[PDB]
């Protein structure tokens, strides 16, 4: 348009450009709206879709099939399509159950092996305590447990010269 | 016959739309609270651009 | 993308700078993972998910100000609504991305599970005292819980049992006063707004850094490429290519430095949650 | 006149006061851009059968504020106080 | 995708987890160029069609 | 520990991070950086001193930038390891050499002791903890007033198995017959909520 270049998606716009005023600009000094120099109509520009690609795998030793996650993009234009709030998965089947789950995905959705199922993570088993103002529960038998924890303290000493 | 031009002499600097933003611009402007010379044939110099107001 | 979008000769020139594109992604990925670990370390400390019973016989104390309300937008407990309104929906669509390689990822835990965790912690505290941190929760009357907590600071228990009404009234009045304190004064929440301002300003500076000559003819790759001949335009390109690397490295280093202190604060908050809430 | 380009701005607004320049703001929109290439230093006004202010333009930095429709509502001089 | 993961990790065994492979851009299908009307043509018949 | 592996995640992560940083630093030594070749000897043996300095300058500046980046990253990592070492020292001094009364600092339960063990680049603790179980619930009461005097328990809590009343310690079920020796009197039973005759 009138010399300025770029790549994007053009959409009809309904802004209030002043008659002498050509094209808009965003806060970060990025073009946002244009006026076409043939019929004097406002027009909107949207950045073209782009995004990363991730691979969810259960391990080569276990199986040899994976699921592909496209982060971001509304996946109508992507060459078992399940749409989430962080991209969309391909290769996993949605379920209506909730399990304390394996490796996460994002936005509360996470997947695991079963054959690569994706669902919504569950906080834990739900129980309600029977509260009253006239009763207390006292233990009768104790147990002794052993817990291990690992704390690093130092790393290898490496020296690099220049010359 | 100096007169204090309070807040006059501000124009659109660039041919660009902008909404709900504060813009810092560096161009030949008329300084605020400056002196304008009232007049009544008299020729005047033209340094780099003149702000000409009239009734 | 950030250094030079959709250009082939620029990519060819960049490929000879070694691999100054992979450690940046690795560092940003490490920061992103640690951010989720920080959130998981604080709240996720309760095994099950307790809920308060419909019985509201707490001896006179009024917890309705902080217990969750079912007729709420996201099951939030009145005070949390003010906290969210005092800080400057988020579900409309997926478009959080800029023109030049800027992506914002959503957190692993959304606000619903955070609210559920806080509600479970509060219900366990009310109906079981400190017994739900060691083993399994045991019910106990609330008045007796207050009596034992008084006994824990030297004051004998019979102070409560003969001054229950005054203490209940003082607690209710204090809960009433904190309402006005939060609603009127806006400067109180001054430690959660600084992070947002710093991050937004850093990103804004990074974006604005693009339009700089850096010693070249112009700040746009396309004009330089399409107005100079290939054999000569190479020298001008490798000034922008050197400037953008410095800008991006500076941004990454600042992000790491400011993430370290956030991790320290998250560890302190985890300690306070584990010791001050689950016990005395 | 900027490096051989003559630019003309203008404004025509009725005013309620009849004493002096009123208090308020009024932006100016460009009309004519002509690259004749004449570097001028003296100018005059002619007539047929009163009172005109004149001011000089100086370099400065301003802080313009735009409204929801891209019209300047106010500006702040930078190096004043 | 498994082969790309093996290549980018530079190993023949991958453990359980999520890895990043690359990024994708939606390539431009065509180009659009717009210019105003071509008015005020130079008079060439004065020196040619005379 | 003998059977299940992949439990020492933190130490492996630290070692992998250091090794990968060294690997990328070493690998960075083979880039042209815009010069003719990535080895000084080739340029030295091919060109002349007056015009072989530009390529050397390019190589020097590139390698210097890479080395500075590596040093800064190592500084950040060392600071983090210092914080971890400080925490480990605090735990060693406070839980091994005594008993910890702060909740959920050493174990999940009521702490009793710990035993340190060495490791390739760290330390491993073995906390011993007390955890109760086999719950049983009775009916309670704040204070028992007898002869017009309201008695409260010294240390314990009042319980009843349906007919009789006893005093028990909080964390274990040990019923004792109520006596003047383990109860103290305070006031009269007319303003307390929950007084039970006995
Ligand atoms: C160039 O000429 C075209 C006609 O060839 C003009 O197009 C007209 O635009 C107006 C509104 O802008 C419409 O109402 C007319 O119907 C259009 N004409 C036709 C034949 O469709 C155009 O405005 C001219 N100017 C520019 C800058 O393109
Ligand atoms: C503590 O007492 C309560 C009430 O007497 C018990 O809670 C209920 O027990 C019945 C047993 O038939 C169950 O059917 C109910 O579901 C329980 N209530 C709830 C809310 O779950 C409780 O079992 C007693 N504690 C123990 C350890 O037995
Ligand atoms: C408390 O728990 C312990 C262990 O869980 C019980 O001791 C067990 O008793 C059974 C039956 O006599 C034996 O077969 C086991 O060998 C014992 N365990 C051990 C480790 O020696 C004990 O009986 C429980 N006490 C109560 C009152 O239930
Ligand atoms: C607990 O506090 C709440 C305040 O949030 C009380 O609810 C208010 O009660 C007053 C008294 O009539 C009403 O005027 C308000 O309209 C109530 N507000 C709401 C949101 O309910 C509640 O009554 C108190 N309950 C107890 C037991 O103290
Ligand atoms: C992904 O895009 C589709 C359509 O592009 C969204 O579905 C709705 O589609 C209708 C018809 O075009 C639009 O009017 C709606 O605005 C779309 N919904 C929304 C929320 O914008 C679909 O919702 C998009 N996916 C997500 C997660 O928002
Ligand atoms: C920006 O422009 C809009 C017009 O699109 C203005 O909205 C008009 O405001 C006037 C003043 O009350 C109303 O009489 C019109 O009905 C409005 N137009 C509508 C609703 O379509 C708006 O006031 C302008 N904002 C400014 C000048 O700051
Ligand atoms: C000069 O006259 C010639 C002869 O007519 C013109 O050439 C043709 O002009 C008509 C009318 O515009 C066009 O439809 C033809 O395509 C032209 N043919 C050629 C071969 O040019 C010519 O345009 C006139 N003007 C000039 C400047 O030469
Ligand atoms: C509650 O505990 C008391 C005290 O142990 C029980 O009363 C005793 O019961 C035994 C036999 O069960 C008798 O030999 C004693 O004489 C009773 N009195 C005393 C003072 O020990 C009582 O039976 C228990 N009640 C229930 C429901 O278990
Ligand atoms: C435990 O709660 C119950 C029910 O709230 C209390 O029983 C009430 O006691 C008051 C005081 O005289 C009576 O007015 C009510 O009629 C009783 N309710 C019922 C349903 O009978 C009981 O007093 C409470 N006990 C303690 C120790 O607080
Ligand atoms: C507990 O004992 C006291 C004193 O024996 C009772 O208080 C009075 O008892 C007499 C005799 O039964 C009654 O006539 C009175 O009405 C009682 N009240 C007063 C104020 O004198 C008391 O009722 C007994 N029970 C409880 C639950 O306290
Ligand atoms: C593969 O996984 C199974 C089950 O987890 C395990 O028994 C086996 O040893 C693994 N094999 C290898 C080569 O790791
Ligand atoms: C989950 O349940 C809803 C309605 O209960 C149903 O429409 C949907 O298909 C179910 N999801 C799956 C994966 O079966
Ligand atoms: C305007 O003139 C008055 C009177 O001569 C003088 O005090 C004032 O400083 C002048 N201001 C400017 C901006 O020239
Ligand atoms: C403006 O004045 C300078 C000398 O001050 C002169 O060299 C130049 O030619 C003038 N500009 C034009 C367009 O004539």
From Swiss-Prot, chain A:
Disulfide bonds join 75-88, 101-110. Changing residue 128 to L: In strain: Omicron/BA.2.12.1. Glycans are attached at residues 61, 74, 96, 133, 141. The cytoplasmic Cys-rich domain is palmitoylated. Palmitoylated spike proteins drive the formation of localized ordered cholesterol and sphingo-lipid-rich lipid nanodomains in the early Golgi, where viral budding occurs. Specific enzymatic cleavages in vivo yield mature proteins. The precursor is processed into S1 and S2 by host furin or unknown proteases to yield the mature S1 and S2 proteins. Processing between S2 and S2' occurs either by host CTSL in endosomes, or by host TMPRSS2 at the cell surface. Both cleavages are necessary for the protein to be fusion competent. Cell surface activation allows the virus to enter the cell despite inhibition of the endosomal pathway by hydroxychloroquine. The polybasic furin cleavage site is absent in SARS-CoV S. Main component of the anti-COVID vaccine Chadox1/AZD1222/AstraZeneca; in which the human tPA leader sequence is added in N-terminus to enhance protein secretion. It is found in: Virion membrane; Host endoplasmic reticulum-Golgi intermediate compartment membrane; Host cell membrane. Changing residue 94 to Y: In strain: Gamma/P.1, 19B/501T, 19B/501Y, Omicron/BA.1, Omicron/BA.2, Omicron/BA.2.12.1, Omicron/BA.2.75, Omicron/BA.4, Omicron/BA.5, Omicron/BQ.1.1, Omicron/XBB.1.5, Omicron/EG.5.1. Contains sequence and structural motifs very similar to those of a bacterial superantigen and can directly bind and activate T-cell receptors. Activation of a broad T-cell repertoire may be involved in the hyperinflammatory syndrome in acute COVID disease. The KxHxx motif seems to function as an ER retrieval and binds COPI in vitro. Variant D614G has become the most prevalent circulating sequence in the global pandemic since April 2020. The mutation is associated with higher viral loads produced in cell culture and animal models. It would not change pathogenicity nor neutralization properties vs vaccination. May be prevalent because the mutation increases virus transmission in human population. Belongs to the betacoronaviruses spike protein family. This is Spike glycoprotein. It comes from Severe acute respiratory syndrome coronavirus 2.
């Amino acid at each position: 348009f009138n010399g300025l270049t770029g790549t994007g998606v053009l959409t009809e716009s309904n802004k209030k450009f002043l008659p002498f005023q050509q094209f808009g600009r965003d806060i970060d000094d990025t073009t946002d709206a244009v006026r076409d120099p043939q019929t004097l109509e406002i027009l909107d520009i949207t950045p073209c879709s782009f995004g990363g690609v991730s691979v969810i795998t259960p391990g080569t030793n276990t199986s040899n099939q994976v699921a592909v996650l496209y982060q971001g993009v509304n996946c109508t234009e992507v060459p078992n399509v399940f749409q989430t709030r962080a991209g969309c998965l391909i290769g996993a089947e949605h379920v209506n159950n909730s399990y304390e789950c394996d490796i996460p995905i994002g936005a509360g959705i996470c997947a695991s092996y079963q054959s690569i199922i994706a669902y919504t993570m569950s906080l834990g088993a739900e129980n309600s305590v029977a509260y009253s103002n006239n009763s207390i529960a006292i233990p009768i038998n104790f147990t002794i447990s052993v817990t291990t924890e690992i704390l690093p303290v130092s790393m290898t000493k490496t020296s690099v010269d220049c010359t | 016959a100096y007169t204090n031009s309070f807040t006059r002499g501000v124009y659109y600097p660039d041919k660009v739309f902008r909404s709900s933003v504060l813009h810092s611009t560096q161009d030949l402007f008329l300084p605020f609270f400056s002196n304008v010379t009232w007049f009544h044939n008299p020729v005047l110099p033209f340094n780099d651009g003149v702000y000409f107001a009239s009734t | 993308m950030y250094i030079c979008g959709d250009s082939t000769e620029c990519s060819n020139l960049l490929l000879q700078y070694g691999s100054f594109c992979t450690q940046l992604n690795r560092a940003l990925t490490g920061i992103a993972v640690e951010q989720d670990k920080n959130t998981q370390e604080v709240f996720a400390q309760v095994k099950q998910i307790y809920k308060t019973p419909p019985i509201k016989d707490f001896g006179g104390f009024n917890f309705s100000q902080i217990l969750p309300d079912p007729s709420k937008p996201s099951k939030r407990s009145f005070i949390e609504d003010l906290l969210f309104n005092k800080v400057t929906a988020a579900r409309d669509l997926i478009c959080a991305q800029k023109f030049n390689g800027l992506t914002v990822l959503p957190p692993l835990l959304t606000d619903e599970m955070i609210a559920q965790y806080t509600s479970a912690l509060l219900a366990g505290t009310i109906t079981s005292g400190w017994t739900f941190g060691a083993g399994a929760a045991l019910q106990i009357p609330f008045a007796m819980q207050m009596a034992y907590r008084f006994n824990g600071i030297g004051v004998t228990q019979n102070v409560l049992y003969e001054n229950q009404k005054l203490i209940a009234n003082q607690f209710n009045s204090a809960i009433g006063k904190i309402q006005d304190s939060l609603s009127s004064t806006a400067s109180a929440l001054g430690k959660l707004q600084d992070v947002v301002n710093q991050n937004a300003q850093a990103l804004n500076t990074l974006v604005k850094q693009l339009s700089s000559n850096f010693g070249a003819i112009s700040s746009v790759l396309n004009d330089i490429l399409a107005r100079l001949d290939p054999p000569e335009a190479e020298v001008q390109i490798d000034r922008l290519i050197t400037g953008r690397l410095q800008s991006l490295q500076t941004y990454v280093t600042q992000q790491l430095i400011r993430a370290a202190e956030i991790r320290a604060s998250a560890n302190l908050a985890a300690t306070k949650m584990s010791e001050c809430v689950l016990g005395q | 006149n900027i490096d051989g380009y003559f630019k003309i701005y203008s404004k025509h607004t009725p005013i309620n006061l009849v004493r002096d320049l009123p208090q308020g703001f009024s932006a100016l929109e460009p009309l004519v851009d002509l690259p004749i290439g004449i570097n001028i230093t003296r100018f005059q006004t002619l007539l047929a059968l009163a009172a005109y202010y004149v001011g000089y333009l100086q370099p400065r930095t301003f802080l313009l504020k735009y409204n929801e429709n891209g019209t300047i509502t106010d500006a702040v001089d930078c190096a004043l106080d | 995708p498994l082969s790309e993961t093996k290549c980018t990790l530079k190993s023949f065994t991958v453990e359980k987890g999520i890895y990043q492979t690359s990024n994708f851009r939606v390539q431009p299908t065509e180009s659009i160029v717009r210019f105003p009307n071509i008015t005020n043509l130079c008079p060439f018949g004065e020196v040619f069609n005379a | 520990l003998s059977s299940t592996a992949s439990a020492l995640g933190k130490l492996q992560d630290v070692v992998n991070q250091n090794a990968q940083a060294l690997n990328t630093l070493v690998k960075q030594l083979s880039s042209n950086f815009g010069a003719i070749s990535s080895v000084l000897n080739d340029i030295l043996a091919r060109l002349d001193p007056p015009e072989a300095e530009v390529q050397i300058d390019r190589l020097i500046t590139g390698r210097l930038q890479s080395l500075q980046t590596y040093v800064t990253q190592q500084l950040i990592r060392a600071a983090e390891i210092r914080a971890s070492a400080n925490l480990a020292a605090t735990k060693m001094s406070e839980c091994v050499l005594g008993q910890s009364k702060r909740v959920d600092f050493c174990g999940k339960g009521y702490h009793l002791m710990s035993f340190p063990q060495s490791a390739p680049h760290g330390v491993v603790f073995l906390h011993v903890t007390y955890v109760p179980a086999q719950e049983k619930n009775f009916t309670t009461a704040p204070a028992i007033c007898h002869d017009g005097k309201a008695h409260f328990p010294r240390e314990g809590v009042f319980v009843s198995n349906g007919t009789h009343w006893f005093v028990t310690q909080r964390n274990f079920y040990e019923p004792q017959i109520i006596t003047t020796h383990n109860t103290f009197v305070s006031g009269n039973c007319d303003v307390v909520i929950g007084i039970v005759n006995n």
